[PDB]
Design a protein around this ligand. Structure first.
Ligand SMILES: Nc1ncnc2c1ncn2[C@@H]1O[C@H](COP(=O)(O)OP(=O)(O)OP(=O)(O)O)[C@@H](O)[C@H]1O
Ligand SMILES: Nc1ncnc2c1ncn2[C@@H]1O[C@H](COP(=O)(O)OP(=O)(O)OP(=O)(O)O)[C@@H](O)[C@H]1O
Lengths: 838, 311
């Protein structure tokens, strides 16, 4: 009865949501300069109302006393929505004569800069010249493209023009043409035509034929000539392919150049990674020379007392020849306004408030271009990076789980994992040249990520004018004038003002390497809380979570947690549960009560209670402790047919129980990686008659004291052709095992251990790659332990891609003729050191 | 509301139920009324460029790529050029009906490119769904001479005088114009009047997705040119040309998968092109699993993918 009215209101409210995110998505597209401030104010207010409505709908969804509270809340929210409706319309005008001219390109006059000003541009212009002009000799080679990817303002058009200006007189045609974010193909092609001949195509911008006949004209004009066109700032490759068809004829002796901030559109060009040209930030010495060229007259050591400041600030820019230019022009009005005071003020300002200045905003547009080109459902992802401290590394897994728990990832295809979608979001952020990736974790993917400094404080401000995040920093020491409308908090080094009086609807909270937690801060007062992050703290009192219902993320890495409450079953809604580095060594029985989980980063020291097979939705499980286990519990593991990544170590079940689990693995079909740990024994788990899951990529083996008898039969190029990682160890070795392994398609990573060589009195033999010719199309990393891998397995046309190789070499083969090296192989196979054995 | 009105119509106790239903429906109508206005804007500077035609660059494809196009181009040639000898026969049209992307402009261009040097004029002109006759006729004029009619798209005389100009320019010559993608024949009848004079030795070609506008041309079923899906063997050759390097017997275990997929496309040289391009990112991304997934997705969810919506 009453609940029917509530739900019928709720559905209408949700429709109102779709409408309001529609409007907000519409408004946020345009830059915040052409928008009149009335729209700004109205948009801010509707966003604030959007938070409240999302809050109400989430509360109703998690709950179903409460009905009356929900009723009052929804009613009043409708009231102020209705009120805000006409406050807008009450004050508008049209102002037909408001046609203000469109703003010019901020990075246009930057093209008009002095040649004798840039430093260090050399030894890169020459490299890019001879990486494409080496084929200019015998100017009959087929045409090719060389894109240039980068980020921010590291300098792409500058080098493109430099190469364009030098090797130019040896061509019949050419054109330097720019493209904006949302171009008109007719404008672009008119631009190209006017760039070729200005006589016959003088007023080519006037005539408006169509997208076709002008393309036909340009195609006709490009016969029996070498053009060397360059096009820069191409976004959303769908545009480029239209230009691509304009170059569809065979033309020996011509090449073209492209630039963009997305590699993900660059692989669509040149069909080869040998033609992609990454550009790097400048070195420290060149950066210092450039910095001192501007401010100082001729000599830099004259102050001898602001040095520490100088190479402390210059580190923040890193290498981008835009930040250094900006700071050098800003900091010297006329020869050192002053010394060591405003420099330190500037250093403190960056991170929280440096951007708001004069003659500085002319370049922040060049950085917000990339943020504006993002589609929706990705602006929140980029803005989420402001929580973490300035100079720290962010593991991508933490980012993905935080995003999913927040609610920024969702779809309605039902063919997606809800986790590979987060991986897709992360990779889209990466290939847009907005995040630097580092390392490779135990998942076969990127380990962690880092953010550029000026991008960091820029997005910090850009999220700061809204209530998207909130930072408590000593250099900043600022609080918004309204404690009520705070949603996200990123506590940092500051440990003084930890007030929590007026933050009821606190979406999230995190603490970074602080002892202030708990003694000054209370979390239990937060009636709602979406995600909780407390890794690195030194508190073990987390037993108040039973009062929390909306929690999704629960990170407790390195927390000194002795125990966690038995009342955790109330958290029916949950996403992740990380407990690595906790003192608790047994989990409570109230985990069977939980229903929705996909990851469990647990350590094998802890005890897993029986009845684990119920967690069907679980997708990745790490470091499972398999000791003193009954058969039914082991067989439960085959029930949940959704797991993606599993890590196993054990010491106490080496029996036929291994075979019982061994086929129970094959019940799975969603694996990505697997690994097994066991000490000093023959592997009495895997049989030679067991079908593996079709999708397998990593299959590592951490232990080196255990061994297999021989190469398993079920490893074959037939099944599991998706491997990119091998990591095997076994007792014996065969010259035919390598021949078998050379048939698998990818096998990017190779690592093999010969137990008998390093544990028994055996001589390193020389296995022979008998059959085939290459057997290794792409195996960059290959490791052989106790096994002789001479360079002469085959001529250089066997492993095109192999950066590194490791093997053992007897000293008795020095006088032999089986070590016949001396030639250079196809990959960078010149940096090798071998463990020689006497 | 259709439900409510049908219920009332079939029926005439019930009166009160009908009353409540209509009243509440009026209530949701009223509520939804102002939800539209409450969140809406104008954004005068929203002038995004018009979307381009997806099938334009398809016209710009390599000649040495299409297979099996022969023995149909020659057939259409000699079913129109058989009267080209004794080039005094009265002018005639040969329309080309089809559906989907079985390939009509491709064959039209192939015939256009081969038997062309034996004519004084000619023009390949497209028409959209909602054309402007002035635009079409300017297109025709520019395709005849680009010197005297270089900036012919600029001047805006009227639908009359440019028609008179094109009629005048077509004296004592054989033109062989081809016009493709004509829909809603009412557009076509306005153009045929531009070809109203006796011209021995000239013809023209038309294409469309409607036969029902094609009988309006050529006044005879002998001049209608049906075009049909390709044969199984030619389709197999085309399918293996793209994905495979040069030969097909290397897998010897996905063969039956190849035949059971290629049957779904049937014969249309667009579905096979699309699947071949989508299916091999770089040399057989996989083996034997997501082809089964793809086959299963036919019927319910295959269309939602990447680089597929372009067709
Ligand atoms: N060696 C250098 N010395 C001095 N200034 C440099 C140097 N290299 C680049 N710059 C500066 O960097 C900017 C050039 O930017 P860039 O070439 O990357 O432009 P783009 O390709 O249009 O796009 P974006 O800047 O967004 O990457 C200019 O401000 C230029 O003065
Ligand atoms: N023998 C062939 N080999 C390869 N591709 C072909 C072949 N025949 C046709 N195609 C493809 O079919 C498409 C041609 O479409 P078509 O000629 O039917 O266009 P249309 O007349 O403008 O209209 P529609 O496609 O709507 O019927 C192009 O994608 C072309 O590559």
């Amino acid at each position: 009865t009453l609940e029917k009215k509530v739900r019928k209101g709720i559905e209408s409210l949700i429709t109102e949501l779709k409408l309001m995110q529609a409007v907000l998505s519409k408004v946020s597209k345009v830059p915040a300069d052409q928008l009149d401030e009335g729209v700004k104010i109205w948009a801010g207010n509707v966003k604030e109302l959007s938070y409240q409505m999302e809050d109400i709908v989430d509360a109703f969804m998690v709950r179903v006393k409460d009905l009356h509270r929900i009723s009052a809340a929804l009613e009043e929210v409708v009231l102020q929505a209705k009120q805000l409706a006409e406050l807008r319309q009450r004050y508008e005008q049209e102002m037909r004569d408001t046609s203000a001219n469109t703003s010019v390109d901020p990075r246009m006059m930057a093209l008009y800069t002095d040649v004798t000003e840039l430093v260090g541009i050399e030894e890169t212009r020459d490299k890019l010249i001879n990486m494409l002009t080496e084929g200019d000799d015998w100017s009959k080679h087929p045409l090719k493209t060389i894109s240039i990817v980068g980020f921010g303002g590291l300098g792409k058009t500058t080098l493109a023009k430099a190469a364009y200006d030098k090797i130019k007189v040896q061509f019949d045609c050419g054109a330097f043409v720019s493209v904006s974010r949302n171009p008109e193909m007719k404008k672009v092609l008119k631009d190209i035509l006017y760039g070729l001949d200005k006589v016959k195509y003088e007023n080519i911008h006037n005539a408006a034929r169509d997208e076709k006949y002008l393309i036909d004209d340009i195609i006709e004009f490009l016969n029996d000539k070498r053009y060397l066109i360059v096009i820069d700032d191409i976004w959303n490759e769908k545009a480029w392919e239209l230009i691509k068809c304009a170059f569809s004829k065979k033309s020996p002796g011509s090449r073209l150049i492209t630039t963009t901030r997305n590699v993900s559109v660059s692989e669509a060009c040149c069909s080869s990674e040998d033609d992609i040209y990454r550009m790097e930030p400048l070195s420290n010495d060149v950066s210092r020379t450039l910095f001192c060229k501007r401010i100082f007259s001729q000599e830099e050591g004259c102050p001898q007392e602001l040095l520490k400041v100088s190479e402390e600030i210059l580190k923040k820019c890193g290498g981008v020849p835009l930040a250094i230019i900006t700071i050098a022009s800003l900091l010297a009005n006329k020869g050192h306004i002053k010394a060591k005071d405003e420099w330190y003020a500037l250093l403190s300002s960056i991170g929280h408030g440096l951007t708001k200045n004069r003659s500085l905003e002319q370049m922040k547009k060049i950085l917000l271009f990339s943020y504006y080109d993002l589609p929706s459902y990705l602006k929140p992802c980029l803005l989420y990076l402001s929580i973490f401290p300035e100079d720290r590394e962010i593991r991508r897994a933490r980012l993905i789980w935080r995003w999913i728990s927040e609610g920024f990832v969702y779809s309605e295809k039902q063919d997606i994992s809800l986790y590979e979608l987060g991986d897709s979001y992360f990779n889209e952020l990466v290939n847009r040249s907005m995040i630097q990736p580092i390392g490779i974790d135990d998942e076969g993917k990127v380990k962690a990520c880092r953010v550029h400094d000026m991008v960091l404080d820029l997005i910090c401000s850009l999220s700061s004018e809204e209530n998207f995040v909130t930072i408590l920093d000593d250099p900043r020491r600022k609080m918004p004038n309204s404690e009520s409308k705070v949603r996200r908090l990123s506590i940092q080094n500051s440990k003084i003002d930890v007030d929590t009086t007026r933050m009821e609807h606190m979406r999230s909270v995190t603490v970074f390497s602080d002892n202030v937690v708990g003694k000054v801060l209370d979390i239990s007062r937060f009636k709602v809380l979406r995600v909780l992050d407390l890794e690195g703290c030194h508190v073990s009192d987390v037993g108040y979570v039973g009062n929390l219902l909306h929690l999704r993320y629960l990170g407790l890495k390195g927390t000194h947690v002795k125990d966690l409450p038995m009342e955790i079953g109330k958290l029916q809604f949950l996403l992740t549960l990380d407990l690595r580095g906790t003192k608790i060594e047994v989990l409570p029985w109230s985990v069977v009560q939980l229903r929705r989980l996909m990851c469990l980063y647990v350590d094998y020291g802890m005890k897993l209670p029986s009845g684990i097979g119920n967690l069907t939705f679980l997708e990745v499980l790490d470091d499972l402790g398999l000791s003193d286990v009954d058969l039914d519990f082991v067989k439960e593991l085959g029930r949940l047919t959704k797991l993606r990544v599993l890590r196993l170590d054990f010491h106490g079940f080496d029996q036929s129980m291994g075979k019982a689990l061994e086929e129970s693995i094959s019940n799975m079909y969603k694996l990505d990686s697997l690994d097994v740990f066991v000490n000093r024994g023959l592997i009495n788990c895997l049989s030679e008659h067991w079908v593996p899951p079709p999708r397998l990529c990593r299959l590592a083996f951490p232990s080196k004291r255990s061994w297999f008898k021989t190469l398993p039969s079920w490893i074959n190029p037939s099944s599991l052709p998706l491997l990119s990682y091998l990591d095997i160890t076994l007792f014996e070795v065969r010259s035919e095992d390598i021949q078998l392994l050379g048939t698998l398609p990818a096998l990017v990573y190779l690592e093999i251990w010969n137990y008998s060589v390093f544990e028994e009195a055996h001589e390193v033999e020389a296995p022979v790659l008998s059959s085939g010719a290459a057997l290794f199309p792409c195996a960059t990393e290959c490791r052989f332990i106790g096994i002789g891998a001479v360079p002469s397995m085959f001529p250089q046309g066997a492993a095109p891609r192999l950066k590194r190789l490791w093997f053992t070499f007897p000293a008795k083969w020095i006088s032999s003729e089986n070590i016949g090296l001396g030639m250079r192989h196809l990959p960078s196979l010149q940096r090798v050191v071998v463990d020689v054995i006497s």
